[PDB]
Design a binder for this molecule. Structure first.
Ligand SMILES: *[C@@H]1O[C@H](CO)[C@@H](O[C@@H]2O[C@H](CO)[C@@H](O)[C@H](O)[C@H]2NC(C)=O)[C@H](O)[C@H]1NC(C)=O
Ligand SMILES: *[C@@H]1O[C@H](CO)[C@@H](O)[C@H](O)[C@H]1NC(C)=O
Ligand SMILES: *[C@@H]1O[C@H](CO)[C@@H](O)[C@H](O)[C@H]1NC(C)=O
Lengths: 339, 1033
């Protein structure tokens, strides 16, 4: 029969139409560029406001000093403070046969940084984002459930089992974690602060709900083969790692996206960092030869963006340039072309 | 015995056989079998980078939507089969009394059925008797043959007496019948009713889909039923026609499979190079798998699953869902609906809506499509006179004065015999009505136009028995008794028909009519007195475009009626050749006639036809018209229906058996060596062909030989064409020089012509129905082809082209970030996003932007898409959709994808982009950052390739952004506590709680819509095209 005569059915719907007259494209480009310049300038302000420090300490064992604080190469430290550094930072190696090549880095904070300070470790060329690497952890076995053999997640397969025993932190993430132990204290030398840090409230809040202490009897389980060295007798009822308490496991388990990643170890938020000379002692357990690249430690603050990355501010400036480069070409070509 | 059901076999599935046939129909394709084999390879352990139920999940959803659309349409099919199937069948009870009201399902071998009037016949029956005493019955073939002549269904004489219920209780016998072959006019059957030999002729052969019109009841001995009849065994499967947009979807998917295997070769060869170069520095993966080619195979599968969504699953199900919805939107159109015949412009093939937008070679029937099949009696060359303005309506009152002046008019008995011929000699059947008039069962519309043309002057034809007397109704007198003595029927090569009549005074005279070249050769006309006037008024009628016949009479004496009654009676007993001996006899008495005059009924062109043909020719379409008419009348048609403009070339070709090389080669010479300006020589070119000349032209020796002069003209008209060369013209043009056709008819001789085009069109309305069923679009009138073809061709072609092309863009622009991340990681095969927003992207968020582009996108308004038919030429030539524009939209996908990847690498540099505490944006927070940014660039490009877009597309283009931004805290807050996506722990707090996440969503999508937005502003202000100008006119 007769189809209905609604506005929808007869393709007669109400429709505004975007006409690209230069009376509505030129104010769009002038408006977009003129609204992305204060935020691009504002975010380069809040991306150069941070005052970080980054010391590559990979070549501290072979490039060592072992007797006194000698000077550092220029290619390692990348400081970006507000004031200027008077005395360039030194470092040395120590070996007390228990620390096994701990590394005293010694840096000079030029002015008292006022924001909350955060000490990371940067690792370059560590593919933490491999397909066989963001898997290979049993999710139940880090929830604390005593999962038996052959009920484990098989993604742990090479670090899954051992001599008729299972590995409690199975898989590729839990094994081979960054075990260089930073000193909890920034040791203020020449009587400035003797500055304390914490390794608490470091991980994600949802990792501290998902990572729970285990329920195994500590005799069926065995530690993974790389940090079998810190547990040479094996797991016992006393030395067993409480994962909910550890809180550096669960910054390494939260795998970062890239081969060039920071990972948080230490921070302080309730006190400023004064302008003295500090030293930090870093026990070199984690070899370079395992992964490929460098391993610095980072002493940074936060801005609007996280730390010193001007790429989003200049990435607003390329937009506010290209909305005022073609916003002038498409006005010179609006006046001089019908001229 | 165990016969089938009563349904026309347009069936797709059955309730048990649904799964192998439907899964073979979907999994016989390429873009569903690809995801079947990636889902089957994806079940290998430690190989799936995403999940298993991701790809088998969304492939399962696509198969459920395909079974939803196919299930709805085949349930509508079976609903029509219940509209035909449920029919009342009064069937005889062998045990108890009279015919009972049963359903169809009690029909078997040799069933005796009584079915009433104004309701369809169930199946093939044999007439034993009817309500008429002879046993013949009146019926029309609405579904069988298309010709609306009511058949005189004769019966066998020895069985016609069985009428009552008491009669056919001792009546049964075996009927060895014809084999079930589809010979319509051939039957062979025997019968032993009472151990007597009864032969069966094909005359008592009421077929399946007939509708009984005028009896009280008819009987029937059923022979064949189910799928065994002569109407349901030749049920054409109508094989599906791949359009001009989806052959290039086939090679377009071949192009994406090419770039896929390029990505997996570059990617996995990169995995061998890095996985064997960095072997010292990747000992924290424990890659002691010694099969390096085995890990090349496994990782090859990780990338063949990882990149596999570049080809989309929800395109070919989305294309068919859009194109069916365009088929719905065309069918629900007021401007395509002709309310007088009440036909709601249904589209039989929903997959060819795009095909409306490239049509170059529209073919057409003249009879009924252009000329409406209403035979109005316009003029008559009477007594060697006509109106020489046109005043034949007023001149006909001077014809009344020509009869009423009986004492002084020589012409008055001659016009008495004229009105006698167009009041008595016919093959039509009169029909009493409920009103105070009479309506004619027209066996021939020419004859009904003659008898009704006499009835306009007070000659009401009273009912005439075939073996009795008749009377008339004259206007001046009261009533006049005439006689049915002898009839001489019409034949093709005879080109005439005659009759022998008895006036009531005893003067038995001959009255003959027919074509000019036969009646104008067997005549005297009182030493050719009214022959030159007959010639020049035929040429007047050949100057006006009217269907014209000629009229004559002669005399029979008593001895010629006696001896010719003998030779005519024993000449009519022949069953060997009924059309040969009766016509040799029927021109033994057709010597030396006396010519009377001519008749001229008009076949008026329809309401919008010349404006339609003119505007279709302005759209760059080479409209042809195929007919069985002669030369000068069809040149008057094309001159009157805008096919033939003033001073057009008119290449006349009226050849013979071997006259081909003269006009064909010499019109190749005058078509090539006579090279005029070729712009005004093009638009003033035509070709007028005889179908007998065309009969030796549609042949593989001389086919392209005719196509070189055929394709050059603007409006090729063909004349006197047998209906086989309609289909040979359609196949001739689709086979060589493959353009996009369209064919129109309204008769059952057009089914081979409509079912062979690139898009067939049938015309409903008048006495034909086989065209509007066996078409791709059923259309009320020929004027609807203008707005449908131009308007909905441009609409459907642009909208489906940007819908398909945008869909390839959006899947390229998401999963190409999966390719650019292969360089970021260790060439591993790491999914950036979590497994289920992968399967929610191309199924659940960006499924609405291709839909509202494919349906609700007015790229140019219809009020000035048909005021400039030149715009149809830009859709016709092949703009808006190609392989070149396809790689333009892919590489727009690569640029937008790599700008999201590289931009978000440099924003989230070390992962350290948070200000909440010292926590870092991990893998998955960055993963939904590039996922969200890729959504905003994808519906940003969707917001830039739409125009005239407000209503149901502000629910789609920002509705997908806002629907994702609402869906993601709900999914990634509720669903990780269900062990289904344990990768979104804290990702809501570390993306939506981020400072730098919304900043990336603000500027970085703008940083690709600079190239998009300024390319769009550049190509409609400083380098425009035609439609870019017309969009503001
Ligand atoms: C710190 O981690 C490294 C590597 O993750 C450990 O080095 C491995 O120690 C085991 C047991 O001593 C050896 O079998 C491996 O060959 C070592 N891998 C190397 C050197 O690449 C190291 O022992 C850990 N230090 C601790 C736990 O104090
Ligand atoms: C921050 O440093 C000051 C001075 O070193 C110390 O007193 C305070 O406890 C520190 N806070 C934390 C949370 O470590
Ligand atoms: C603060 O620093 C001193 C330095 O030796 C240390 O002994 C003390 O435990 C620290 N306090 C903390 C970590 O709360």
């Amino acid at each position: 029969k007769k189809p209905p005569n609604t506005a929808f059915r007869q393709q007669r719907l109400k429709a505004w139409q975007p006409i690209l007259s230069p009376q509505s494209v030129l104010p769009l480009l002038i408006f977009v560029a003129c609204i992305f310049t204060p935020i691009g300038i504002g975010l380069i302000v809040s991306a150069t406001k941070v005052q970080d420090l980054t010391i590559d300490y990979s070549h501290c064992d072979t490039k060592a000093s072992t007797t006194a604080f000698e000077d550092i190469p220029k290619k390692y430290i990348k400081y970006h403070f507000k004031s200027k550094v008077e005395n360039k930072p030194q470092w040395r190696l120590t070996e007390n046969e228990n620390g096994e090549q701990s590394c005293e880095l010694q840096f000079e904070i030029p002015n008292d940084i006022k924001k909350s300070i955060f000490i990371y470790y940067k690792i370059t060329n560590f593919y933490q984002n491999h397909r066989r690497y963001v898997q290979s952890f049993d999710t139940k076995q880090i929830l604390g459930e005593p999962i038996k053999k052959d009920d484990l997640d098989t993604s742990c397969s090479p670090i899954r089992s051992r001599e008729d025993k299972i590995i409690y932190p199975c898989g590729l993430i839990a094994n081979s974690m960054f075990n260089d132990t930073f000193s909890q204290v920034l040791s203020g030398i020449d009587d400035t602060e003797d500055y304390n840090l914490t390794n608490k409230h470091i991980s994600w809040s949802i990792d501290r709900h998902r990572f729970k202490t285990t329920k195994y009897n500590a005799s069926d389980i065995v530690p993974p083969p790389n940090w079998m060295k810190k547990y040479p007798d094996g797991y016992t009822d006393e030395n067993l790692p409480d994962i909910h308490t550890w809180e550096e496991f669960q910054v390494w388990m939260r795998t970062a996206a890239f081969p060039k990643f920071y990972k948080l170890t230490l921070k302080n938020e309730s006190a400023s960092l004064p302008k003295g000379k500090y030293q930090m002692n870093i026990e070199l357990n984690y070899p370079i030869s395992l992964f490929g690249g460098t391993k610095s430690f980072v002493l940074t603050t936060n801005g609007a963006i996280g730390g010193r990355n001007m790429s989003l501010g200049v990435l607003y400036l390329i937009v506010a340039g290209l909305c005022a480069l073609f916003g002038i070409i498409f006005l010179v070509k609006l006046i001089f072309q019908p001229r | 015995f165990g016969y089938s059901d009563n349904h026309i076999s347009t069936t797709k599935y059955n309730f048990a056989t649904f799964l192998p046939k439907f899964l073979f129909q979907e999994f016989s394709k390429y873009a569903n079998l690809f995801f079947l084999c990636t889902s089957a390879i994806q079940q290998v352990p430690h190989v799936s980078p995403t999940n298993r139920y991701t790809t088998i999940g969304t492939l399962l959803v696509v198969l459920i939507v395909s079974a939803m659309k196919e299930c709805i349409e085949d349930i509508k099919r079976a609903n029509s089969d219940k509209e035909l199937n449920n029919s009342t069948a009064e069937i005889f009870s062998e045990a108890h009394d009279d015919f009972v009201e049963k359903r169809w399902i009690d029909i078997r071998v040799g069933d005796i059925i009584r079915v009433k009037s104004e309701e369809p016949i169930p199946a093939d029956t044999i007439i034993l008797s009817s309500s008429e005493p002879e046993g013949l019955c009146y019926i029309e073939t609405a579904n069988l043959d298309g010709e609306t002549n009511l058949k005189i269904k004769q019966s066998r004489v020895e069985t016609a007496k069985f009428i009552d219920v008491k009669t056919l209780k001792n009546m049964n016998g075996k009927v060895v019948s014809e084999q079930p072959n589809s010979s319509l006019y051939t039957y062979e059957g025997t019968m032993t009713l009472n151990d007597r030999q009864i032969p069966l002729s094909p005359d008592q052969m009421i077929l399946r889909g007939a509708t009984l019109r005028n009896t009280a009841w008819i009987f029937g001995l059923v022979i064949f039923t189910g799928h065994e009849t002569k109407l349901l065994r030749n049920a054409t499967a109508t094989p599906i026609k791949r359009t001009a947009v989806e052959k290039i979807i086939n090679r377009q998917i071949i192009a994406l499979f090419t770039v896929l295997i390029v990505l997996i070769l570059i990617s996995s060869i990169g995995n061998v190079i890095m996985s064997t170069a960095d072997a010292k520095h990747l000992s924290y993966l424990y890659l002691e798998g010694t099969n390096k080619a085995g890990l090349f195979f496994k990782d090859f599968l990780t990338f063949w699953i990882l990149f596999s969504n570049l080809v989309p699953i929800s395109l070919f199900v989305t294309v068919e869902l859009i194109k069916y919805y365009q088929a719905f939107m065309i069918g629900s159109d007021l401007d395509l609906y002709y309310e007088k015949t009440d036909t709601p412009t249904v589209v039989r093939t929903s997959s060819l809506v795009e095909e409306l937008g490239q049509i170059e070679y529209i073919f057409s029937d003249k009879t009924g499509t252009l000329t409406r099949n209403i035979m109005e009696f316009k003029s008559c060359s009477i007594a060697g006179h006509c109106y020489i303005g046109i005043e034949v309506g007023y001149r006909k009152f001077d014809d009344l004065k020509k009869k009423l002046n009986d004492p002084s008019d020589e012409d008055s008995p001659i016009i008495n015999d004229f009105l006698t011929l167009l009041a008595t000699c016919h093959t039509v059947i009169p029909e009493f009505q409920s009103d105070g008039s009479i309506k004619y069962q027209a066996a021939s519309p020419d004859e009904g136009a003659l008898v009704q043309g006499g009835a306009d002057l007070g000659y009401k034809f009273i009912i005439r028995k075939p073996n009795s007397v008749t009377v008339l109704l004259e206007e001046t007198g009261e009533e006049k008794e005439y006689q049915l003595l002898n009839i001489c029927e019409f034949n093709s090569t005879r080109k005439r028909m005659s009759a022998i009549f008895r006036f009531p005074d005893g003067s038995i005279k001959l009255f003959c009519k027919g074509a000019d070249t036969v009646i104008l050769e067997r005549l005297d006309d009182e030493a050719n007195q009214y022959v030159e006037a007959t010639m020049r008024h035929l040429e007047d009628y050949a100057s006006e475009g009217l269907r014209t016949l000629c009229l004559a009479m002669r005399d029979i004496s008593e001895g010629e009626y006696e001896e010719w009654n003998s030779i005519y009676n024993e000449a009519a007993t022949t069953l060997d050749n009924r059309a040969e001996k009766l016509d040799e006899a029927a021109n033994l008495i057709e010597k030396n006639l006396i010519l009377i005059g001519a008749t001229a009924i008009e076949d008026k062109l329809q309401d919008g036809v010349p404006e339609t043909i003119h505007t279709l020719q302005e759209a760059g379409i080479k409209i042809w018209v195929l007919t069985g008419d002669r030369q000068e009348t069809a040149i008057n048609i094309g001159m009157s229906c805008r096919l033939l403009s003033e001073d057009m070339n008119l290449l006349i070709i009226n050849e013979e058996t071997r006259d081909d090389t003269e006009r064909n080669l010499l019109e190749k010479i005058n078509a090539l060596n006579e090279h005029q300006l070729s712009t005004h020589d093009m638009n003033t070119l035509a070709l007028v062909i005889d179908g007998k000349s065309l009969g030796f032209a549609l042949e593989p020796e001389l086919e392209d030989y005719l196509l070189t002069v055929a394709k050059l003209c603007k409006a090729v008209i063909c004349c006197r064409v047998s209906p086989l060369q309609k289909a040979l013209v359609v196949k001739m043009v689709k086979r060589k020089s493959s353009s996009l056709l369209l064919a129109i008819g309204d008769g059952a001789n057009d089914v081979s012509m409509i079912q062979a085009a690139h898009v067939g069109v049938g015309i409903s309305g008048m006495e034909g129905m086989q065209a509007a069923r066996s078409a791709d679009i059923a259309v009320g009138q020929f004027k609807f082809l203008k707005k449908l073809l131009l308007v909905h061709g441009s609409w459907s072609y642009q909208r489906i082209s940007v819908a398909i092309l945008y869909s390839f863009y959006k899947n390229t622009a998401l999963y190409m970030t999966q390719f650019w991340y292969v360089f970021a990681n260790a060439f591993s095969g790491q999914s950036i996003m979590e497994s289920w927003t992968m399967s929610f992207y191309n199924l659940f968020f960006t499924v609405w932007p291709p839909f509202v582009i494919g349906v609700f996108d007015q790229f140019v308004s219809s009020r000035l898409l048909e005021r400039y038919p030149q715009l149809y030429k830009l859709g016709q030539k092949g703009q808006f959709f190609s392989v070149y524009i396809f790689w333009g939209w892919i590489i727009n996908g690569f640029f937008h994808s790599a700008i999201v990847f590289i931009g978000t690498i440099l924003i989230y540099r070390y992962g350290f982009a948070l200000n909440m505490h010292g926590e870092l944006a991990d893998h998955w927070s960055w993963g939904v950052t590039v996922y969200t940014t890729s959504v905003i660039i994808v519906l940003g490009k969707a917001a830039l390739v739409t125009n005239q877009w407000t209503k149901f597309t502000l629910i789609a283009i920002p509705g997908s952004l806002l629907f994702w931004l609402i869906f993601f805290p709900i999914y990634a807050s509720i669903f990780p506590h269900a062990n289904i996506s344990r990768e979104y722990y804290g990702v809501v707090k570390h993306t939506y709680g981020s400072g730098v996440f919304w900043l990336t969503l603000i500027v970085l999508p703008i940083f690709a819509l600079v190239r998009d937005f300024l390319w769009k502003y550049y190509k409609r202000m400083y380098e425009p095209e035609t439609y870019h100008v017309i969009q503001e006119m």
